[PDB]
Amino acid sequence: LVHVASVEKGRSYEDFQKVYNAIALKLREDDEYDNYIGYGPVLVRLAWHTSGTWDKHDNTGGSYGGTYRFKKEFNDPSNAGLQNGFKFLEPIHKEFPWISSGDLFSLGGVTAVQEMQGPKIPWRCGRVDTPEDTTPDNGRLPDADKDADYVRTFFQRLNMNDREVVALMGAHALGKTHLKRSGYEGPWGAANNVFTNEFYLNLLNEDWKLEKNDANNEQWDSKSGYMMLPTDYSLIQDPKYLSIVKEYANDQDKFFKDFSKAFEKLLENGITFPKDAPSPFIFKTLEEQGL
Numbered sequence: 001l002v003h004v005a006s007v008e009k010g011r012s013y014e015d016f017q018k019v020y021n022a023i024a025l026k027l028r029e030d031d032e033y034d035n036y037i038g039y040g041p042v043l044v045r046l047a048w049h050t051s052g053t054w055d056k057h058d059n060t061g062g063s064y065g066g067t068y069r070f071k072k073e074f075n076d077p078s079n080a081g082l083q084n085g086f087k088f089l090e091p092i093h094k095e096f097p098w099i100s101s102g103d104l105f106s107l108g109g110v111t112a113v114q115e116m117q118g119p120k121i122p123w124r125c126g127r128v129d130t131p132e133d134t135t136p137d138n139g140r141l142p143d144a145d146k147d148a149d150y151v152r153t154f155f156q157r158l159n160m161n162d163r164e165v166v167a168l169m170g171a172h173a174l175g176k177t178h179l180k181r182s183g184y185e186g187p188w189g190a191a192n193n194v195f196t197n198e199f200y201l202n203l204l205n206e207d208w209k210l211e212k213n214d215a216n217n218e219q220w221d222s223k224s225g226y227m228m229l230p231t232d233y234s235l236i237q238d239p240k241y242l243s244i245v246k247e248y249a250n251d252q253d254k255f256f257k258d259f260s261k262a263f264e265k266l267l268e269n270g271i272t273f274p275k276d277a278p279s280p281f282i283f284k285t286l287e288e289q290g291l
């Protein structure tokens, strides 16, 4: 199936900047969530999980249809906790009922990265809601207890290469693992609601010990109180991933640029943009607007 981007009728960059801004203002206001981490990280994860169901082989799943709104997908065990991002976005959608679900979930992620001082992420509109029977089955999102070979093969289905995978994984600077959600517990670093290359620095520089958590799963833990999932740690076990980890640990701008590209790509897999579609939008942050 072909999913052609269709601009919400009559809307232009200013309309979407208003949605951006409303997301960004609520991110600022609703600051208590998750022990004052705030909603930035879970909005980034929501954008990724609503996009990461894509299968390049038949164009099923992906961000276009906004299918997370249907119970099969919002109740995927892999999506445990993302209901908090959805509830956050609900008043946004009520204020701007014209935006499609896929456009709102993906825009939430863009807005979160940027408001957390991350790179600009160009964003295109035009996702169109598709019906309940287009919701992908559970099981397309990745397991965390696996090795580098798993990770590499997993991400081929999303048409991501080694550099794109290592870049995307840098989002694990943000937020934390929650035992009751995923069976893993702990943050990956100190700056977990500011977008930086800390994930790579911690991988290389902390002294990691392989421990079992209280759900009886293995994870890597440091004396600083940080953790890494087995799939995170695989990025320094595999020599190809390791090289790229070192690159991003040593060049913040390069990480920003590569993350931006990969994240836009993730959010756009499966969508065909007509030749005369609008160019991608780059939203101003609240700070850049003086708001």
Ligand code: HEM
Pocket: 041, 042, 044, 045, 048, 081, 142, 143, 144, 145, 151, 168, 169, 171, 172, 174, 175, 176, 177, 178, 179, 181, 182, 183, 184, 229, 231, 263
């Ligand atoms: C091999 C791939 C990946 C695996 C196995 C994985 C696994 C996980 C797990 C188990 C959690 C913790 C969930 C919880 O307990 O709350 C998590 C959190 C998170 N992941 Fe991933 N992840 C992967 C890739 C990504 C990518 C590609 C992104 C986005 C670019 C991403 C963004 C996040 C964020 C932002 C959080 C924190 C959420 C929060 O604090 O609520 N992850 N991930």
